[PDB]
Amino acid sequence: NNYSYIDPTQLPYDHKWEFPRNRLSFGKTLGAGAFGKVVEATAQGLIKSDAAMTVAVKMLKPSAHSTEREALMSELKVLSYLGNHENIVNLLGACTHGGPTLVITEYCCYGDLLNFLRRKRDEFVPDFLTLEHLLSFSYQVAKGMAFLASKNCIHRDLAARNILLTHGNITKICDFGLARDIKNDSNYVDKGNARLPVKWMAPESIFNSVYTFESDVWSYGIFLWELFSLGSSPYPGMPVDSKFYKMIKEGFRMSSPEYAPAEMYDIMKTCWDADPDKRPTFKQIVQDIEKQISES
Ligand SMILES: Cn1cc(-c2cc3c(N4CCN(c5ncc([C@@](C)(N)c6ccc(F)cc6)cn5)CC4)ncnn3c2)cn1
């Protein structure tokens, strides 16, 4: 074993990220859960010494178990190893002393795509949301995940609620709390006992707790359905129950959403192949959508 995969979570925290927490002023809460929250904040002198900048800050509550603190640090280390990409919510800094650990990321001023699509739903036509916008969002998300996959990382919670929108109609993948580097094993088996995004999950993830590059692609197919339905909930009217799992196992798939081009529903159908090996890669999806964009 003289050659090994470098586990990014085993690498030392790089203090190049460190930022004084008293230069942050917290604002509105952007998301919250049992373990912690993400808040809007002003960062004084973060990039330029004399300028204030709006950021998002991720934090655990003081009651958070030791397991949660290490997990937030592991997320920080994954983001540090991944590096910058246009289509992810990038790491900007961290506060690792003087209080609870804070992870400072880019702030996306339009919020999550799911809520955005639901707002623009009434005024959509194929500042009006158009089909060109939807194709762009599909392309940008595929580019972001191709980047993640090229770094041997899986996200494991891809969904329109975890895609954010910023200036210039740029979409960024967010929430890397469950992202894993799967270099060594080519998959990840989840040993946890958390609430899971069942309607976005590949059947092998539901039934065998197996997560792979191919299960991220399944979720991307679901995301496309959210996108071209302008934010409808997946499997409308179907609760998550015995019948849901049975139908998924037997091959039931959502039909084409109202505004999806035939070539985009073709992508979703392949993303939802019961055989993971028959699903496209994100690199293939990027190329496919690139062709569709250039044909207007
Ligand atoms: C109305 N509006 C909204 C935005 C907006 C929203 C974000 C954003 N997000 C916020 C949501 N997210 C998020 N919420 C909760 C968790 C937790 C609960 N699971 C969690 C928290 C801390 C922790 F230690 C462990 C888990 C995780 N993540 C992140 C993405 N990031 C950037 N800009 N931005 C801009 C803009 N207008």
Numbering used by the authors: 566 to 691, 762 to 931
Reproduce the article's own wording on this structure.
Avapritinib is the only potent and selective inhibitor approved for the treatment of D842V-mutant gastrointestinal stromal tumors (GIST), the most common primary mutation of the platelet-derived growth factor receptor α (PDGFRA). Against this background, we solve the crystal structures of avapritinib in complex with wild-type and mutant PDGFRA and stem cell factor receptor (KIT), which provide evidence and understanding of inhibitor binding and lead to the identification of a sub-pocket (Gα-pocket). Furthermore, we report the identification of a sub-pocket (Gα-pocket) located in the N-lobe of the kinase domain, which is surrounded by amino acids of key regulatory elements such as the Gly-rich loop and the αC-helix.
Intense screening and optimization resulted in two complex structures with avapritinib in wt and gatekeeper-mutant KIT-T670I. As anticipated, a water-mediated interaction of Thr670 of KIT-wt and the N4 of the pyrrolotriazine scaffold is clearly visible in this structure. In contrast to the published working hypothesis, the water molecule thus forms a polar contact with Thr670 instead of a water network involving the catalytic lysine and the gatekeeper mutation, which results in a loss of an important interaction. Finally, comparing the binding modes of avapritinib in PDGFRA and KIT, it is striking that the interaction of the catalytic lysine (Lys627 in PDGFRA, Lys623 in KIT) with the pyrimidine was not observed in KIT. Additional water-mediated interactions were identified in KIT linking the ligand’s primary amine and Lys623 and Asp810. Apart from this, the mode of binding is very similar, and almost all interactions described for PDGFRA are also evident in KIT. Interestingly, we observed that the Gα-pocket addressed by avapritinib appears to manifest only upon ligand binding. Thus, our detailed analysis showed that the binding of avapritinib to a DFG-in, but αC-helix-out conformation characterizes it as a type 1.5 inhibitor rather than a canonical type 1 inhibitor.
